[PDB]
Design a protein around this ligand. Sequence first.
Ligand SMILES: CCCCCCCCCCCCCCCCCC(=O)OC[C@H](COP(=O)([O-])OCC[N+](C)(C)C)OC(=O)CCCCCCCCCCCCCCCCC
Ligand SMILES: CCCCCCCCCCCCCCCCCC(=O)OC[C@H](COP(=O)(O)OCCN)OC(=O)CCCCCCCCCCCCCCCCC
Ligand SMILES: CCCCCCCCCCCCCCCCCC(=O)OC[C@H](COP(=O)(O)OCCN)OC(=O)CCCCCCCCCCCCCCCCC
Lengths: 83, 347, 318, 139, 175, 98, 99, 96, 88, 171
Amino acid sequence: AGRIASFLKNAWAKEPVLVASFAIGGLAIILPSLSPYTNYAIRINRATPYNYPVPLRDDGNMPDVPSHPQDPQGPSLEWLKNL
Amino acid sequence: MNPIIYTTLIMTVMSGTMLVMISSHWLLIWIGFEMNLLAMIPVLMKNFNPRATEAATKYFLTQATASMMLMMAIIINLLYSGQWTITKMFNPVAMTMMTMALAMKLGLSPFHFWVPEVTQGISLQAGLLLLTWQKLAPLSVLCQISQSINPNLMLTMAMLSILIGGWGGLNQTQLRKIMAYSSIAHMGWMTAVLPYNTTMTILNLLIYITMTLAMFMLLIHSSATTTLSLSHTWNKMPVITSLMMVTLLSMGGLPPLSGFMPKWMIIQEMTKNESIIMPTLMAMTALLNLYFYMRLAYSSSLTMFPSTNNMKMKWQFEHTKQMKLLPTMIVLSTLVLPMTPALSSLN
Amino acid sequence: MFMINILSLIIPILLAVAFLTLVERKVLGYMQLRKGPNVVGPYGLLQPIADALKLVTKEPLRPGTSSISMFIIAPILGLSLALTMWVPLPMPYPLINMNLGVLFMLAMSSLAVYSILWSGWASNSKYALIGALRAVAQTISYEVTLAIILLSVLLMNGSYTLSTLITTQEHIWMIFTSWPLAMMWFISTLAETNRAPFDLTEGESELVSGFNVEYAAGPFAMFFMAEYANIIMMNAFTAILFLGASHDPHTPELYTINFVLKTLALTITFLWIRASYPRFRYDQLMHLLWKSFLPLTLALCMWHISLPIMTASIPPQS
Amino acid sequence: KTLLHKYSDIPEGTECHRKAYASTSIGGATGLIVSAYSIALKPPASFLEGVARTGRYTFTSAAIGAIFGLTSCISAQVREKPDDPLNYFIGGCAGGLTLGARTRSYGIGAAACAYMGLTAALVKMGQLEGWQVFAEPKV
Amino acid sequence: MTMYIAFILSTIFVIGFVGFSSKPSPIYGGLGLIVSGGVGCGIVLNFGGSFLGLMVFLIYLGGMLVVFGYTTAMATEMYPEVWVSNKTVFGAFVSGLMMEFCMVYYALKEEEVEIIFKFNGLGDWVIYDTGDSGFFSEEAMGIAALYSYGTWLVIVTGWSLLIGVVVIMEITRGN
Amino acid sequence: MPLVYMNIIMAFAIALAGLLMYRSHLMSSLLCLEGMMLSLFIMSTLIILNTHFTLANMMPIILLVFAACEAALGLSLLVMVSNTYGTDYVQNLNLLQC
Amino acid sequence: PFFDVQKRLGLDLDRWMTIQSAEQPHKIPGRCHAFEKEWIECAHGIGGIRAEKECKIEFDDFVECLLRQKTMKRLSAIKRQRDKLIKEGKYTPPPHHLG
Amino acid sequence: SMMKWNRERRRLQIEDFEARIALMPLFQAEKDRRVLQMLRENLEEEAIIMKDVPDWKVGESVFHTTRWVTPMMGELYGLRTNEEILSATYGFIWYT
Amino acid sequence: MNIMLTLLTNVTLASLLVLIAFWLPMKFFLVAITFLLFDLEIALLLPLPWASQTNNLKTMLTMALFLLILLAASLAYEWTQKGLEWAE
Amino acid sequence: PGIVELPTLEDLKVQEVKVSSSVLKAAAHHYGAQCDKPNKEFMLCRWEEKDPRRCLEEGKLVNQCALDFFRQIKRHCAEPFTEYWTCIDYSGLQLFRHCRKQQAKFDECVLDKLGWVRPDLGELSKVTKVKTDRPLPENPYHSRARPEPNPEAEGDLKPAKHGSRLFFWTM
Ligand SMILES: CCCCCCCCCCCCCCCCCC(=O)OC[C@H](COP(=O)([O-])OCC[N+](C)(C)C)OC(=O)CCCCCCCCCCCCCCCCC
Ligand SMILES: CCCCCCCCCCCCCCCCCC(=O)OC[C@H](COP(=O)(O)OCCN)OC(=O)CCCCCCCCCCCCCCCCC
Ligand SMILES: CCCCCCCCCCCCCCCCCC(=O)OC[C@H](COP(=O)(O)OCCN)OC(=O)CCCCCCCCCCCCCCCCC
């Protein structure tokens, strides 16, 4: 560890450039996994609608889908509102 | 070429050709062809001699346009069909474009003109890859689209291949050049039945690859490139020349040698399809292949050409190359004829 | 009334470019203890008119060993794009609202090297050939970093719609988020601009003339305006990218005032660097980017794509 | 195969003028093909030499077809038998004599009659029994 | 006029192709294709291909052909040519446009051109389709699927282009 | 088949003819090699953009990324023969006679 | 393919793009998705020989959809007859053809 | 600051888009009547123009199927004047 | 309409400005090829801004760095094996 | 190939809305949340029937139901509505973030005079169980019959009779 820490500082002396970029790429590639928000990003990305939410024929016994757009039934993105 | 870089570059050609046979998308078929082309050029330029540059330039100039012509019939077929799946072509002129484009990537018709010199210019090992591994990737496409190719166009190009390939071999000296003309003649043999039956095309491929790879890279063991140079090898290694004649006689296709495997099976299928003039002329010009095959065997082992005094030096030494997979490859390329029902396995 | 709008965009820059030569030499002189042009009119305010009325009356001498077709076209498209650059600029309301303006802007920026190419070739001189050789290769080599820098920058902004730039930059300057890109972007222009230390395109004291070659009088005029109107452009391109402003829908006047001042400040800084610094060397010119700028730009681009997904800050442009 | 239909449509032993002109066209058509290739692989001298090469190659090929079509058809008329394969042989090899005439070699002319006549006879058999050279894939 | 903008762009495309494929001096040959690349964008743009057409303006047209112009600088013939310098190139240029001119004449008369394929000489605008694209910009979201649906295409593009750099410096290594 | 499609494929056809009509300059042939991939790109784009084959917009770029890759090696090949022959003239590109 | 490694492994490599009736970004339909559905559904488990003769009506309707050819022949003769009938001055176009 | 502002703009997008989804049913009906009014005009003119042509029955199908097909614009707007053709095809592409 | 009209008028003024002032009075190749390859790879990640709005950005995420890694890797090879260091 | 019979000009005279985009988008959410009954089944008709001609009856109803909503505002706080929609147009994007104060004024008026609440975020973007009377089409694409698949291969494998049977080879 002493020589490795010496080598890393050895790098920083004779060159400050590629060590900084190697650091930048190193973090930018690892934090994606260690993230509490990347799940929100895909949830946000899918939340935005580009197409009409095609209605389905009501044959009865539809538990969760609403009948009115203001009905409480259905998915709510309130988690985005406080976000 | 650093061995690590050399190994990677061959792997890309290994990968590029493998991509063609595993792709179901027309683009992906063209995709690996371009990668395969992109990787061989440095392999051919192994010695950087001016002749090697000439060979690489000729190979690139005749193959890049074929890939460009390859893409042309893809979009035209897309234009008239709208599907990229590797299937029958639903537009005639596209496939008329297709067969010529695939063939000139290979070279059977006048398209074949690049094969002789390009083989000569590149090194003997580099000549092997171009002539025993580059014939699978175009054949992979032709096998898949064999359902609807125009029989008139394909058979004519197959006729010209064996007719031009055998005829030019007679007047050739550099063993690399006889190799190219021998390959041109055999490619017409394997692709002649391609519209009729696909299984015996692949039969010829495995059979032709084994003998061609064995006798190419055995010729590397002899370390010779000219008929006179190959002639001298009887004094040093007479076993090599004796093995040279066996595959040379197999190369012609004299029973019971395994080189008669394709020639026999091809005539059987064309006869089954009522095409009987087609095989007879196809069989006749195969005698031209045997003539320069027999001439080379004459100068190699069947007689003894004069040697040189300085060659006594070589007797005290030995080869260092380990002839990877060579010894077994003669055995299954000259004696596998009794194992003829193995055809059904390829189906 | 579209034609008057085009003229209202073409006339000012030509009047600016001629009048920018005044301040350039004069601001350079004032950081050299000089006064600059001040004897011709009030505070020299007439020199822009003098040179604009002198290189157009000087007799243009075509090279003996040259094809005048290239000798004429190379000046023309050297400048014509520099005026076309201002077409999609989102000065409050851009002239053309190209949804892919940034790519269109970079397309003509890449077209500029062609005016470098035939101009050096057509004159057919040892200085002309080598002067072209270094100039175009330097510009294309620094274009690859230009492409990456934007790719990192507008990724937070959204698409390449230059009009959206005002919307995203609405509470803080984009430089406050990507200031390591700012120095990456600003300096990378200094070569495409053919400006300060990256001056090997022309080489004042050791190459006589480079990009402009010997093209004189007529060909000189719009070759002079070629990378002079461009300077005002990528001064404005940076002034809209990072150092943004505010845009009130009921008063677009404030946006222009902020935009022109920041662009003008950037132009002065170009002149600030013009003579203050020494000149780079071509070996170091390529050394700087492919070995320092490129590896650092690549990592920063890698950081600037992950970051919106790190914090769910992807743009709503689409 | 418009030219091929042009020839084969004419019944044997009649319309000899049409059969001859069709024979010239087929012989002429292959003249351009061989001459165009010859100019390509072997670069000739200035254009007048190139067309001189082209003229010679086309002339022989047209001439071989011209006399062959004439004699192959009148033989059926004179001998009153169109079906016989010999009806093509007696003119099929005379083209070899024509080739020898334009090349000035007795040996090559006689040998060409040995070969071309046999092939011309073979072509007649091909049309009679139902031979196919480029047969469609049947099995 | 305005109604024929795709037709007029297409015929300028052909004459640009004829001029540069007739093989004038290579630096002039580049220009003959550069304008063809320039008018090629208009056809793509007019059909909704805003990104793809503009993409061709940055790479290739403003990219790789710069290297072609670069290559013709140091590795050039001592006397670069021109359509006046040689007679064959002059003849090729006239033949190409005459062939094009005779073709559009055939297209304008009966619109029943059968050569190779069966063409129709009607207006260029007919082939368009009617229908809103919503808010997604069709083309823009089509090539944005490079990283959502691209899959195999991504690695092979990366690998071949990476293999594009092992090959280059190896062949220009000087033994 | 409209006229706009025709003008592109015909441009490809004349591009194909000039490619294999090598004059005494390899660069010109390389330039005429440059024609088809652009013609292929244009021809592909009109088909794909017209028919709203959304995913197929892949291939136009995919066509260009590798069809330019031969040009990467081809130019170096051209400079290679110009480093030993000192000339891109193709008449001297016949050393492989025998 | 020659060696259909996709079927054995079960991983989709290029099948996603092979036709435009597969999944598309944000459910954007192809210009001829309806006819692709009909032709593909007509020709499955039938082979490449039977389908080319049996499922021909679907193909003919579809092959017209991509590059609409027969309908321009419909449109071209509409334009030709309309031009002829106005050149000599018999048919008067309605005002709805204009403002 | 950019992260907080960008999230607000995403909420703006769904606010903007939600209006469009409510708007679309009216537009679908408007375009449906507009497009089918025009095709009604198209074959109404077809009867008058084409009667001497020997078997040119009005409104012949081109697709063998009886299912509705999105009409090609070349016959929707095609029979109209040159101006509205130009403003429609290259209208969105050209408006800038 | 406005696009090519703007191009037309810009060309006319620039062309006039010269006419009114005309009548009235291995290393270089090597880096260029590397530029072409990097510039071409740049075309790959250009559509990234739209690609950041897909519903499976995870696959978009990892594969986008893969292009940037390979640009880094291609630079690394061209760096160490002399290469980018110019010939002497 | 047949007849392309399409509805006459008689039924294509609906009381088309004469408003512009800004006033259409100014209400939008309230119109969407108060006229969903004729919107949902008409759009469902557009998808299920896959043909514009068969949904003309629902096509006129949605336009007609728009008028009842629109003139309801006129008998109410239409003056705040006019100030709103005359401020939206001034922005080139027709964006709500620059007209929040008039957004309130329209909302506060419509909140008590009529009661149409402001649809919360994401409420409109919701699949709904719209009730309908028409039966689903038996084949929306009017697909014809299907070719009979080839007979399935079956039967236990049996050794090849007399072996390979290829020329003289046996076993
Ligand atoms: C979680 C955090 C994520 C992000 C963190 C990012 C890392 C931390 C920040 C690092 C610094 C910023 C990025 C790097 C910038 C420097 C790049 C570089 O190569 O530097 C060394 C280089 C010199 O490097 P060198 O040549 O000494 O060494 C490089 C390595 N070798 C030797 C192997 C080649 O600096 C320069 O080139 C200086 C500039 C030269 C051009 C002349 C003009 C300069 C004008 C300066 C004044 C105006 C500034 C305007 C700024 C913009 C205004 C809008
Ligand atoms: C199908 C048609 C025919 C095909 C084959 C035709 C072959 C000959 C064709 C003509 C060839 C050209 C003319 C002659 C060339 C001679 C080549 C040569 O190298 O000759 C000299 C050489 C000297 O011998 P040397 O290499 O020292 O080896 C001696 C044995 N150790 O000699 C040799 O190298 C020869 C070595 C021969 C080794 C024989 C090994 C026999 C093994 C017997 C195993 C028995 C097992 C019994 C089992 C019983 C229970 C089942
Ligand atoms: C029933 C229907 C048909 C009726 C008409 C009969 C058939 C058509 C006429 C006969 C065609 C075959 C006979 C040969 C024709 C070409 C002859 C020719 O080109 O002669 C010129 C030349 C010979 O001399 P050369 O080798 O050049 O050497 C001296 C150089 N100073 O040779 C050359 O320059 C060319 C090289 C030698 C010849 C090569 C082979 C040419 C013929 C190929 C087969 C053509 C078959 C045509 C008929 C069937 C198909 C329709």
